């Protein structure tokens, strides 16, 4: 055979039908795949609905003598019963696509994959991460990709890869038992593949056993058949993920103060299993958690997290976007802790204002103790412009760049670079924003009209070619050469942007003649067109005498 | 017996029945507690009411020869008559819970407590503090707990603890004679417990006798059988409560000038008893007061309290959130002295922006030496929002909360608390506003329409129930279920608020059809109706086809 | 003979007749003055023209054997020949007022001056100090007048003062030689006077010599027959002028680098004769320059001058308006080193907002390290308003003052003066603005209409009489007494300011009736006339029934 579907079931009567159908609707030969469903001793008509697919699917039903309490053992007993060339672990609450086994079998015969990663899609609001399923790579490792950011068994593994190297689910450890199964596959797979052509997989205690599994992963990486420099970098990105997205992230804040001695000890043996040379590779804000984990000093560990949330430190000084923190009278100085990273999460504008939203992802300092201002620096480093913070929420700072405020300053230069100024007392940081951002919500070269001294200019936001950073292009134009004015119907004025697009502020509008004016409603139909739904009909001979044209906050005389 | 309820009555004919019912409704054996009632020579029929409880309770009735002037003497006369193992001082105007004695004996039998503190709860608006009854603790001392913040005799004392140490209420001092009693019992107790499982207690002249009690407390603190360091600390926290809550707090600003020399002499002999070494442990703002109390200088004492009210000082400078104040010409320099009083004098809001005016009534620093920001904190303390200062005048700080800038940050949570950040260099003060304010010029549950991603929400400014503090409530609504759109006449659209009133910005407003628009005005008729006086008339069949409806600066899709 | 006029000439043939005529034209008896011309070995016909006057004047004519290169040796030769009671030096290209000797003679006989300054006047673009010639003064000193700011020898000196004290021009020092001569006269003079009734005097290389003269002056001052504190004070004034206006100012920025060591060595020897106690007496900015001059250290000296000129300092803070500056690593801090100049480069306003731009023309600290706010201060100093910065471009600071934000605070006072507050940490500058400005863009008394609690007010910018600064006058008005409203045609409403112009924001506007509304476009046709071009006709009977008039952002109930 080719595949072998393993399904851990436990009290899944109300939704096993959604999975047994996906396996039946499979666009794949029935003789080249099987479904091994081992039950964890259910108390409902679960096997009785599975047996409704014995004729539609090659089936191997098994049931444990007693309940195990997790998908660990049901997947292991089914792993010994699997006779196919590959395995696919699917929980009973999930389902797959109709062409999942078809596209996977072809992808195997072309790249000869040992571990295959299919892109997942979340239903009913389930994540399911995405940082590794943006492209289709026939070969990845734990450094050049993000496969280390997903460790669930919802992937495709080679049966010989897991049986020869002895890779089974730890039955005794019911806490995150899956993270060891995948990491053992990642370190022992000669080639790891990521498939991302469509949506394939559709998903729906004492900290002792948890921190033991983490220690097992740190040991498997150090003892794998890889280069020593690569072993700690793989272990570093694993600590980059554990201390940021697992339950360890801030346990001294949430876990009861009575049970924190139980946490710091179990976590202590995990970090003690990681060499102290790896601390230079993990994220700099995690090193104070790595030192206080080995020493098992919970009091000094609870303070490091409390010093991060509220941004209060006992003693500190800054050396270029990186601080040197002393969390207590006598504790050592952690140096090289982190210029703050800036990502432009939003960018909207028109002929009235410019609304940007810069978000500070990695800023160790707490919010409120530092002041930020948006800097608009010229290319020749002569003129600049500072726009204050309009409103902020957490580390999302929104600036409202009103054009009327900066109209009399743009004609100084044609290239206005957009920096973000960060200041803490007397230390001013100059971060160039642009290279990290979301998808630009406009078409390229989309400018906005600016009237100034009976002349017309266009403020063109664009990204530089060097480092993809955003700037503002301010140059003089001619109206009749950029935007055409036509009369659609008898109560609509269409402004069509010829060479480029021109966005404008939607809402109320007003056109003016020598002796009459008509009110209208402006609305952006497309990126290079604008409709003005007027109140009364304007005759075409009156359309030739449009003296002035205003918006809801800006005016333009013809 | 296990308990001896001591009841000092005097003309309690109108409310002793509630107490005598609560003492009979106890879920406690009758032979374990006695009610020792000592009347202070009443003028009415108070005793005739007590006598009718002799068949339900083991009653002890007595009456002094003349009125003593308070519960002072009647509490000691009942103490010699009390033969139960423990005493319980309950005023003639208050009453206790059904399970008071029952939950007290079981708790004493489980920890052998010498002073038990039952949780007090006030009726008809009576404080009754709350800081020390947040938890049920088996053992607490005068430095790791707030038990010093409650010196009322309404507690459970061990008959041996009071008698074997000559702990009796002083008779010759009528002012605060009950604080020396509890402090004598606090220091001499080997174990102090606090029972806060439920609500147990329901509570309803020359200063020569006042500060004389305070003097006996300071000497009692210095002559206790504790460590010398623990003596000065218990003496300090006593000064931290006396000078903050008793009559000393600002007496020079209230007492007549002809009687302030009398006050500065009595308060002096109490402060002269406190060694000058203990002042280093008192709160820094009281050290100037403790100095002029020993010197008994009332002209310089009044100078300090007036300086603390208005923020004026003869010569000062700020050194890291702490000021060094000299109150007069030729006086020593008090250094290292360290929240402002806020009253929301105005609050206006609509579907466009929010206007609130927060005023600083009392601050220990002049304007221009600190920054202020408006904080909108979430209930779970996960999210936050800061609005920059729009304008200020002296100490009246006004903020403009533009809804367009904050619409992207509200749906993160549903409850937002309104704080007030005040940063002096780096030390921040987060003041909860709303309780002190002017009259709320709106009706309760008055919300405001908000539009975001074709959804309809409501911003409901409300006041919390625990502390009357203002907050904002964000949740979803159905437009056709909270607001109705009707046609008054032919040129008026009457917006009606059903379940709650909605405020909107008055001014220009337009309705848009598919191929026709209409200009109009917007005037808030009443608090739950809005008039849209249009420019032209509109037929009833066209009123059904209103696709979009805007205000002065906001749009809304129908 | 009252006067001896001493004239050094050198190739003066083209201009010598002007002086000789002015001496011949003196309204003074010829017997009572002589003219002593000593020619510095001219190669033209200077002497022959001079001889033409030997009958009109008592003339002594001499000529040196070789050109001395300067007036020093010629004047000394003449002074040895002078028999006048007084001498007057006039340069060969200068000339004197016809009434000079007559007026000076009378002044001398009334006051017995030993040194007599006579007011100078520059022709053809020359100056010529004036600041010490604003008044006539019979007796001045170096410390209570500005005489130390003019050291040329174009003055009247008592011959016996010079000869008895051996006061001659240094011949071997060719630079600034007249400064030593005049300093010596001042210090020996019993009375120094200034005669300013009219314009009397009409005026048309290595640094070893320059700084050698300066060192002799220091020695001369310190050795004078004056009080010790006075010697130090006089010397401080000489240093103030010398570093500010002599060739010493900025020498490390102008002189070739290879020669700056030579400058600092001659300058160093000069400053080394000045006791260090005197540095405390000099303008604070000069103190670092004095320090490094004494040490003859050009590298640190050049850094100081460059730091001043570019506003960059290695490390500094500001305490109460003065800077503490460390100019280089390891160097001493110089403390208490000394307001920015402000020009109002824009001012626009309407009934909706005020827009003003302030430009810092000169400021000892670069952009970004200070904060600025606009301050409105009531004339009685009781109330204050602060407006945050809206945007800034380099040192151009723009403030948008939204009148809706300040409407509630304006009624407290009538006069609001505009200040710019500049805060650097905790040192605050209050700079009154208006006296430096671009041309005010409105007719005087042009006002804005404000509506507040059913009452109408005008906000009127104006300029003060005493210092021409800008203030805001806020007072109540009666609308129908101040502004007329009339109908022009059928679709235009004209608002005319009757007593003053009223400026309104241009753009959309509306008039509201009790059952109707009409939109329009507002345009400012003149500075006291506003036109609202309505979207339709209005009957005369309904124009009288306008209840409400709205602009783009404001409403006015009529």
Residue numbers in the entry:
A (entry chain B), B (entry chain C), C (entry chain A): 1 to 204, 216 to 349, 352 to 571
Pull text from the paper.
In this article we describe the crystal structure of TarS, an enzyme responsible for the glycosylation of wall teichoic acid polymers of the S. aureus cell wall, a process that has been shown to be specifically responsible for methicillin resistance in MRSA. TarS possesses a D(91)XDD motif with aspartates coordinating a metal cation, a feature that is typical of the GTA superfamily. Altogether, TarS features a novel architecture with closely-associated trimerization domains connected by a linker region to three protruding catalytic domains that face away from each other.
The full-length TarS crystals diffracted with strong anisotropy and a high resolution limit of 4 Å was applied. The higher resolution TarS1-349 and TarS217-573 structures were subsequently used as molecular replacement search models to solve the structure of the full-length TarS, revealing a “hanging basket” like structure with variation in the relative domain orientation of the three catalytic domains with respect to the trimerization domain. Although TarS was co-crystallized in the presence of the UDP-GlcNAc sugar donor, only the cleaved UDP product seemed to be observed (ligand mFo-dFc simulated annealing omit electron density shown in S2C Fig) and the crystals were too sensitive to withstand soaking in higher concentrations of UDP-GlcNAc as for the TarS1-349 crystals. The difference in angles is unlikely to have resulted from crystal packing artifacts, given that the catalytic domains in the full-length structure are not involved in any crystal contacts. TarS furthermore displays a pronounced electrostatic sidedness, which may be related to membrane localization or substrate/partner interactions. The physiological relevance of the trimeric architecture is supported by size exclusion chromatography-multiangle light scattering (SECMALS) with an elution profile that corresponds predominantly to a 200 kDa species (theoretical monomer molecular weight is 66 kDa).
